[PDB]
């Protein structure tokens, strides 16, 4: 039997400002920092430890991991930072206030952009400042694989290779794994692990900075999962 622990980044500046974020590299608020620290103390107090961690290339997730590591005295463990764990790419909605967007385009249209499994938001223009092509984080990713927008289906397809190629072999080797990532990248993983349908997964909400523990059997099939804390 294996345990795998998941955590969404703490409150980001754009969570506070009610903006779609996607791949824009915004940082944690003081409240986000505190959530991250609290998650680390909770894992420490429950006697959890880790051998390795995976995270995105986005600093809200990485700094969340840093706080967890600091509180746990695990600053020395290997960390794999992967663009494959990045939040779902929100296209031309990245940076827009969610309430002002629904006001302009209507709740129905925004429902689609937030919840349609297979239909992405409107794309960035290739020359947008927010496009990923000149970013050193993605310099070794083939240009064709870099998104200008994503539906959750795209996000799942992008995350799973990291699981197959690295995380699953890590777990099977008896490494105690922590994944510090984002709402939709974690939903993508949870969808695969729990075999959740296209329709069901769209309604799963993961709170900021709460450890989510998965117990897996010999075939990496979930036995049970649960949040730690209150
Ligand atoms: O801006 V979202 O919390 O619907 O990924
Ligand atoms: O505000 V998010 O990258 O789960």
Author numbering: 1 to 230
Provide the authors' original text about this structure.
The enzyme 2,3-bisphosphoglycerate-dependent phosphoglycerate mutase (PGAM) catalyzes the interconversion of 3-phosphoglycerate and 2-phosphoglycerate, a key step in the glycolytic pathway. PGAM converts 3-phosphoglycerate to 2-phosphoglycerate through a ping-pong mechanism in which a phosphoenzyme transfers a phosphate group from an active-site histidine to 3-phosphoglycerate to form a 2,3-bisphosphoglycerate intermediate that subsequently transfers the phosphate from the 3-position to yield the 2-phospho­glycerate product and a reconstituted phosphoenzyme. As a key enzyme in glycolysis and energy metabolism, PGAM is a potential target for novel antibiotics. Here, we present six X-ray crystal structures of an additional Gram-negative bacterial PGAM from Burkholderia pseudomallei bound to various ligands.
Two vanadate structures with Burkholderia PGAM were obtained, each with additional molecular entities covalently bound to the vanadate. One of the properties that makes vanadate such a powerful transition-state mimic is its ability to exchange its O atoms and derivatize with a variety of ligands. Derivitization of vanadate by glycerol is not without precedent; in a crystal structure of human tyrosyl DNA phosphodiesterase, glycerol from the cryoprotectant became covalently bound to vanadate at the active site at one apical and one equatorial position. The crystal structure revealed that the glycerol O2 atom had become the apical ligand of vanadate opposite the N∊2 atom of His9. In this arrangement, glycerol adopts a conformation and position similar to the glycerate moiety of the natural PGAM substrate. Interestingly, electron density consistent with a tetrahedral oxoanion, presumed to be VO4, was observed adjacent to the bound glycerol, occupying the position of the binding site for the 3-phosphate of the substrate. Difference electron density was weaker for the tetrahedral vanadate, but the presence of vanadium was confirmed by calculation of an anomalous difference map (data not shown). The tetrahedral vanadate oxoanions were modelled at 50% occupancy. The three equatorial atoms of vanadate were approximately coplanar and formed polar contacts with the side chains of Arg8, Asn15, Arg60, Glu87 and His182 and the backbone N atom of Gly183. This arrangement of the equatorial O atoms is nearly identical in the glycerol-bound structure, indicating that the vanadate is providing an accurate structure of the transition-state structure of phosphate despite the presence of a nonsubstrate ligand such as glycerol.
